[PDB]
Amino acid sequence: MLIKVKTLTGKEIEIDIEPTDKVERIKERVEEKEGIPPQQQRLIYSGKQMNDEKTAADYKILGGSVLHLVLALRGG
Amino acid sequence: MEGLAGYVYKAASEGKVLTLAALLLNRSESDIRYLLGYVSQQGGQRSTPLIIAARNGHAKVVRLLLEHYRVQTQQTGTVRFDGYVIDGATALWCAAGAGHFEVVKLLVSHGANVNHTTVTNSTPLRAACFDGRLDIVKYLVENNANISIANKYDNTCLMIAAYKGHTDVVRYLLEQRADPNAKAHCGATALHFAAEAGHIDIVKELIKWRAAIVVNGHGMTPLKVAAESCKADVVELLLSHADCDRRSRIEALELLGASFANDRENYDIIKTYHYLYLAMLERFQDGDNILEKEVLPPIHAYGNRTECRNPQELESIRQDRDALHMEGLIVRERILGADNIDVSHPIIYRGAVYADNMEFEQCIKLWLHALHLRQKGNRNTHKDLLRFAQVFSQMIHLNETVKAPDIECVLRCSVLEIEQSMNRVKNISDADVHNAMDNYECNLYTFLYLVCISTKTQCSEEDQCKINKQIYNLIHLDPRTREGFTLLHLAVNSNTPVDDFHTNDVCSFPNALVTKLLLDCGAEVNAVDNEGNSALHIIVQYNRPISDFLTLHSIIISLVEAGAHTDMTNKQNKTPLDKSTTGVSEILLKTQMKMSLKCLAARAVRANDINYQDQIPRTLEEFVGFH
């Protein structure tokens, strides 16, 4: 399951995580191709933000979509 | 009794006679006067049944009430004509105002006041010639109607007829001993109106009647009025008056071609050079007694042209398309002194043509000079700012740089305009302040558009600082709209309209950068509107966090950059987090939110309603009001 999440400049994030995975580790790879550390990006799933494991099936199991992450600091 | 008067009034207005007679049958004298005379509000007119019958041209209805029922002809009523509202007009005034000959003669035979005066000092004879009926004018004049009586604007029966296209009443009134030297409020006579109207036949009758041309209240000869208003044949009608000398003939001929160089409805290039050719040729006629034109120094806005002081100077630009348009602007401004309320119209039209012809620097210069002339002339330059915004956004929408000092001058002109616009709102009473308030809101919208364009400029540091200083001055002149909205409030508001004409393609609201520029200019982020909402309370109400997330996010972090208080509560007692209606917006606010003991303490005090007045510092009371 490829990821095409936009960013502050409409960039790309490669989560490469299936809908059965948790956003605690799914967002780790998404920001790995972006630059942010995993425990720093408050990823917003077009109306909600991940918390704890946050299994990707909860967010409608969307394929790629446009996840406009929040780049707030001091979240670790 | 109340319902019956409505049908009787409707019967007289709609022309039915049999129904009107049936209702008025078996009516006592008390009901006769009450039914005939009671005012009814129909179509904005507080007219009596007799007045509306004369207004609608129902002679039979009027005749029946007059001859047998004996209705008064001195009753005062209100009517609504073509763009004019007249109050207090009798049945005779409206019948002649509506141009009904079959009703005027019945009323005068009954004994109506022929010299009756309405609220605006108006005579039924004046209303007769205003409508355009010759038969009513001739009959009313013979029935002791004072032609010399003018309105509160000092406009006589001849002057109102001269502006209209009715020569028949003009000829009769002129020979009926009507003074052609009578002046309006601004010194204007009948020929002043006729020259602007453009009636050859009316002007011919005036000069033969010893017009004795004089200047108006603006110091403008009406012979140049025809030249100013692109009246080709009217200019070549008073030059043979044998009292216009030679210098005044030069001014009349130069102005007409100059106006013809720049006119949307009178655009021509052969008559542009033709009239200027004869004026300068008449200058170079004496030879050893040359009459030199008072050439003003060349203006940077109008290129670098110093007019034509030689006959061969204009000959070299005979086929020049650009020079003829440019030269006409210079000579017309030189002739009129840039003091006319309409001298900017050829300039603004030439700039509009240049903008429509993909010319930018010239049109910007012309529009800037026009704005300067209108601002020193104290004009409501809201459409000016709107078209500046349109041309700037069109220039930036085609990816061409726009010079900041040109933007700086119009922005520096806008703030003085807005400062006077706020004065215009405050000084003008509650009569046209509703249009003044809308004009001020339009000025604020245009200022937002120009600053949005400025965000796309190259932003040279000194000129950018100048723009920031002008916006700083505007902010320190505390601009607030009728909803309590500041420039920040409308900047963060998505509901704020953006002009469709070549502007909405660039300026999109809400815009984060201009708001950021508002924060760089020290705008009060903690302001409250009439609703009690701040900019934070309105920006969270945006219904599109997906299509444009950044314009929703970058503003909020820009919002909380100089003291935006996230925990303040509006008049309607709603936290900005409560007024979210969007998970992204509320989570952004929470990430930008920072806790404070004062916030929770004030919220606890207000939620439990402890008396804090005269017991806590006044700033703490203001913070309590914030919560």
What would the 3-class secondary structure string for B261-310 be?
HCCCCCCCCHHHHHHHHHHHHHHCCCCCCCCCCCCCCCCCCCCCCCCCCC
| Residue closest to B489 by CA, chosen among B457, B507, B514 | B514
Phi, psi of B218 (to 5 degrees): -90, 5
Q: B544, B548, B550, B558: best mutation site toward chain A, by most A Cβ within 10 Å?
A: B550
| Amino acid, res. A26 | I
Under an 8 A CB cutoff, do B591 and A8 touch?
Answer: no
Residues of chain B contacting A68 with CB distance shorter than 8 Å? 545-546, 549, 584
Q: What is the DSSP string of B191-251?
A: HHHHHHHT-HHHHHHHHHT-------TTS--HHHHHHHTT-HHHHHHHTTSS-S-SHHHHH
Asked whether residue B476 is marked as a ligand-binding residue, the answer is: no
φ, ψ (nearest 5 deg) of residue B484? 80, 5
Outline where chain A has alpha helix (H): 23-32
Phi, psi angle pair for B85, to nearest 5°: -115, 125
Answer yes or no: are the C-beta atoms of B133 and B101 closer than 8 Å. yes
Start-to-end CA distance of chain B, whole Å, equals 59
Query: In this structure, what token pair is assigned to residue A6?
Result: 């936009």
Q: Does B585 touch chain A (CB under 8 A)?
A: no
3-state secondary structure B480-536: CCCCCCCHHHHHCCCCCCCCCCCCCCCCCCCCHHHHHHHHHCCCCCCCCCCCCCCHH
Which structure tokens are listed for B553?
């996010």
Nearest CA-CA partner of A49 in A24, A74, A29: A24
Angle at alpha carbon of residue B543, lines to B539 and B548, rounded to 5°: 80
Burial class (CB in 10 A: 0-12, 13-18, 19+), B91: buried
**Tokens representing residue B145 in the block:** 């109607």
Report d(CA B563, CA B623) in Å as an integer.
Answer: 13
Kind plus residue range of the DSSP H or E element containing B329 = helix B321-336
**Cβ contact B110:B131 at 8 Å:** no
What is the domain range of residue A17? 1-74
Cβ B583–A72 below 8 Å, yes or no? no
* CB-based contact A68 B583, cutoff 8 Å: no
Interchain CB distance below 8 Å, B587 and A49: yes
d(CA B3, CA B11): 13
Beta-carbon contacts of residue B202 (< 8 Å; ≥ 6 apart): B162, B167, B170, B194
**B214-239 burial code (b ≥16 CB/10 A, e <16):** eebeeebbbbbbbbbbbbbebbbbbe
Helices B344-356 and B321-336: crossing angle, nearest 10°?
160
Nearest in space to B363 (alpha carbons), one of B321, B385, B392, B386: B392
Instruction: Verify whether the Cβ–Cβ distance A47 to B553 is below 8 Å.
Output: no
Quickly list H helices, B36-72. 49-55, 59-64
Q: How long a stretch of residues is chain A?
A: 76
The answer to whether residues B590 and B613 touch, using CB atoms and an 8 Å cutoff, is no
Write the single-letter amino acid at B572. Q
Contacts of B533 (CB under 8 A, 6+ apart): B489, B570, B571, B579
Asked whether the beta carbons of A15 and A30 are under 8 A apart, the reply is yes
- Taking phi over 0 as left and psi of -120 to 50 as alpha, with beta for the rest, A8 belongs to alpha
What angle in degrees, to the nearest 10, is found between the helix axes of B433-455 and B512-520?
A: 90
Rg (alpha carbons) of chain A, rounded to whole number:
11
B544 touches chain A (CB under 8 A): no
Beta bridge partners of B45: B42
Q: Report how many domains make up chain A.
A: 1
Report how far residue B315's alpha carbon sits from residue A14's, in angstroms, rounded to the nearest whole number. Answer: 72
Q: Which helix (H) or strand (E) holds B88?
A: strand B85-89
- B104-109 LR contacts (CB < 8 Å, sep 24+): B104/B128, B104/B136, B104/B139, B104/B140, B105/B139, B106/B59, B106/B62, B106/B63, B106/B66, B107/B54, B107/B62, B107/B66, B107/B73, B108/B139, B108/B140, B108/B143
Residues 6+ apart with CB under 8 A from B187: B214, B215, B216, B217, B218
The H or E element spanning position B89 is strand B85-89
What is the rounded CA–CA span in Å between residue B201 and residue B195? 11
Q: What is the CATH number of the domain that holds A22?
A: 3.10.20.90
Q: What is the CA radius of gyration of chain B?
A: 33
Contact between B237 and B204 under an 8 Å Cβ cutoff? The reply is: yes
Name the phi and psi angles at A5, rounded to 5: -75, 135
User: How far, CA to CA in Å, does B322 sit from each of B255, B351, B403, B432, B440?
Assistant: 18, 12, 22, 42, 36
B108 phi and psi angles, rounded to 5 deg:
-70, -35
* Alpha carbon distance B273, B103 (integer Å): 53
Structure tokens at A72: 């707030």
Phi, then psi, of B96 in degrees rounded to 5: -75, -30
Please, are residues B225 and B196 in contact by the beta-carbon 8 Å criterion? yes
Closest Cα to residue B58, out of B103, B123, B122? B103
Half-sphere exposure of B281 (CA within 13 A, CB side): 7
Kindly list the residues from chain A whose CB atom is less than 8 angstroms away from the CB atom of residue B587. Answer: 42, 44, 49, 70
Token look-up 């003074």 returns: B179
CA A47 vs CA B163, B276, B538: distances in Å: 66, 70, 19
Residues B283, B574: Cα–Cα separation, whole Å: 77
Q: Does B587 touch chain A (CB under 8 A)?
A: yes
- The residues, any chain, with a CB within 8 Å of residue B436's CB and separated by 6 or more, are B421, B424, B425, B428
**Alpha-carbon distances, residue B565 vs B370, B516, B518, B593 (angstroms):** 44, 16, 17, 9
Q: How far apart are CA B169 and CA B136, in angstroms?
A: 9
**Residue B113 amino acid letter:** N
What CA–CA distance (Å, rounded) separates B29 from A74? 93
Torsion B234-B239-B243-B248 (CA) sign = positive
Say if residue B218 carries a ligand binding annotation.
Answer: yes
Structure tokens given for B312: 């061969």
Backbone angles phi, psi at B604, to 5 degrees: -65, -40
SS3 label, residue A30: helix
Burial class (CB in 10 A: 0-12, 13-18, 19+), B619: exposed
> If DSSP codes are grouped into helix, strand and coil, which group holds residue B358?
coil
Q: Say what the resolution is, in angstroms.
A: 4.1
Instruction: Tell which residue, B98, B104, B59, has the closest CA to residue B79.
Output: B98
Q: CB count, 10 Å around CB of B429?
A: 7
What is the dihedral sign for C-alpha B613, B618, B622, B627? negative
What does the buried/exposed string (b/e) look like for B329-360 if buried means 16 or more CB atoms within 10 Å of the residue's CB? bbbbbbbbebebeebbbbbbbbbbbbbeeeeb
CA distances B236 to B191, B210, B252, B335, Å, are 15, 18, 9, 18
In 3D space, the residue among B315, B463, B486 whose CA is nearest the CA of residue B403 turns out to be B463
Residue B427: how many other CB atoms lie within 10 Å: 10
CA B450 to chain centre: 22
User: What's the rounded Cα separation, in Å, for the pair B418 and B405?
Assistant: 19
CA-closest candidate to residue B79, choices B100, B58, B52: B52
Q: How far apart are CA B270 and CA B328, in angstroms?
A: 13
The method of structure determination was cryo-EM
Provide the token pair at B163.
Answer: 């502006």
Are the beta carbons of B448 and B491 closer than 8 angstroms? yes
The answer to whether the beta carbons of residues B315 and B323 sit under 8 Å apart is: no
- Give the largest CA-CA distance in chain A: 30
Q: Does B512 touch chain A (CB under 8 A)?
A: no
CB atoms within 10 A of CB B86: 19
Which of B587, B589, B593 is the best substitution to test chain A (most A C-beta atoms within 10 A)?
Answer: B587
Contact B549/A at CB under 8 A: yes
Q: How many Cα atoms within 13 Å fall on the side-chain side of residue B68?
A: 8
User: Do residues B506 and B399 make contact, with C-beta atoms less than 8 angstroms apart?
Assistant: no
Write down how long chain B is: 627
- Count chain A–chain B contacts defined by CB atoms under 8 A: 26
